[PDB]
Design a protein around this ligand. Structure first.
Ligand SMILES: *[C@@H]1O[C@H](CO)[C@@H](O)[C@H](O)[C@H]1NC(C)=O
Ligand SMILES: *[C@@H]1O[C@H](CO)[C@@H](O)[C@H](O)[C@H]1NC(C)=O
Lengths: 105, 99
């Protein structure tokens, strides 16, 4: 159904045949980033639920794979699995907790 | 020595034509497909090739079959060793049996 990530297709009739108009999705403008497989926070290894960890140089964000939409790393979009002594390439960062400012106010 | 079969085919009007792509060109295509698979994943077949580390690409592959990606990162050396052993088994089977 065409080259790229397929979205839709439309048929057209032709003599002794058929013509398909394949509508696809093609990524356009890439950008280099620094990435890590996991985030070490409080002695716990955090992995992204959906997406990928990226860094613009100073701060770390989590974004979806096919579109650069950076978001703050939070326990909602990450899950915890084990400690930091096993994963190769794990980096140190903080993970935001939404419950603490709601409890403080 | 003696007359060949190919010479007797040639002398009677039967001719074998060479293919358009040589074996070096097929090897170039195969090496390009392998390098794009290793260094980009599936991204080079749907557009431009975007680099990704091979452990993270393999975690994407594990996530595609219904296994969480901490399973790869907590068992990375075992999976690498199993892959290397299976490639060596393919080497042994190709050097041993030709059927
Ligand atoms: C990323 O880095 C490579 C080498 O450092 C460079 O050739 C390339 O232009 C950079 N940008 C993109 C979008 O790939
Ligand atoms: C991450 O933090 C721990 C303690 O918080 C420290 O022992 C370790 O060296 C740090 N890792 C890096 C790469 O700085």
């Amino acid at each position: 159904c065409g080259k790229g990530y397929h979205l839709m297709s439309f048929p057209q009739s032709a003599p002794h045949g058929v013509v398909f108009l394949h509508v696809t999705y093609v990524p356009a403008q890439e950008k280099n980033f620094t990435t890590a497989p996991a985030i070490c926070h409080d002695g716990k290894a955090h992995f992204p639920r959906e997406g990928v960890f990226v860094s613009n140089g100073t701060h770390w964000f989590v974004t979806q794979r096919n579109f650069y939409e950076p978001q703050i790393i939070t326990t909602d979009n990450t899950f915890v699995s084990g400690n930091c002594d096993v994963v190769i390439g794990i980096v140190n960062n903080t993970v935001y907790d939404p419950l603490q400012p709601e409890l403080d106010s | 020595a003696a007359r060949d079969l190919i010479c007797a085919q040639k002398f009677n009007g039967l001719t074998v034509l060479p293919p358009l792509l040589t074996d070096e060109m097929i090897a170039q295509y195969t090496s390009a497909l392998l390098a794009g698979t290793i260094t980009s994943g599936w991204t080079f077949g749907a557009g431009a090739a975007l680099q990704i580390p091979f452990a993270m690409q393999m975690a994407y592959r594990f996530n595609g079959i219904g296994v969480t990606q901490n399973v790869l990162y907590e068992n990375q050396k075992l999976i690498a060793n199993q892959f290397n052993s299976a490639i060596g088994k393919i080497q042994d089977s190709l050097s041993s049996t030709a059927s």
